[PDB]
Amino acid sequence: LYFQSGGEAARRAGEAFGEVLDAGDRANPALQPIADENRRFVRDHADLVERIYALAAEAIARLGTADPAAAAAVVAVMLGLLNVARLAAHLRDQGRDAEAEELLALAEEILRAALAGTPEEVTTTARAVGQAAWLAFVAGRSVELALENLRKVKEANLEERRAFAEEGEAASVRWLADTYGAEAAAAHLAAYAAGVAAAVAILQAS
Ligand code: NA
Ligand code: NA
Ligand code: NA
Ligand code: NA
Ligand code: NA
């Protein structure tokens, strides 16, 4: 990672995201279990965290951090691969290491290919990759569904990728409200947006 210029800046940005989301979730008894699980993930899967920062460093190298759209795209890449990594971590914790790699490799292929375009295109693809994994995680942690979803993103044009990201994001809001209640869900989503903004600003200053 150290010969991947940008890895330390990506880490600072991701840690800023994590700190802000942690504080938002930790402030509310309904959301604290999320903050605790997120700390456990980072503690237990340092190798996946570093792999996320490595892909972010590739995004920094290609897009720069000289403007808000590029910075947002790098953050979106990290958050999209993080969603993939949560399912990969489940697979690894359960001894299904090869399937975890297949999942990570396909997500990384799609994200890397998007880096040839504009930041706004990268952000759309990254959001779609994130939902491809998240939707499969909630539906029984199915690597088969995740791979199918990722292949559908791969074969989708930009508008179709955006539409899929929007459907998944809407389903995600619904899941948060169903699980934590609408009131706590709104607080969580606001903290998430603040964490994105924190990470964007760290990248811009890097
Ligand atoms: Na790099
Ligand atoms: Na505690
Ligand atoms: Na964990
Ligand atoms: Na996300
Ligand atoms: Na994303």
Author numbering: 7 to 212
Task: Provide the publication's sentences verbatim.
We highlight the general applicability of Riff-Diff by designing enzymes for two mechanistically distinct chemical transformations, the retro-aldol reaction and the Morita–Baylis–Hillman reaction.
Experimental structure determination resulted in a 1.13 Å resolution crystal structure for MBH2, one of the designs displaying the lowest conversion. The structure agrees with the design model, showing an overall backbone Cα RMSD of 0.53 Å. The catalytic sidechains superimpose well with the catalytic geometry except for Trp140, which adopts a flipped conformation (sidechain RMSD 0.54 Å excluding Trp140).
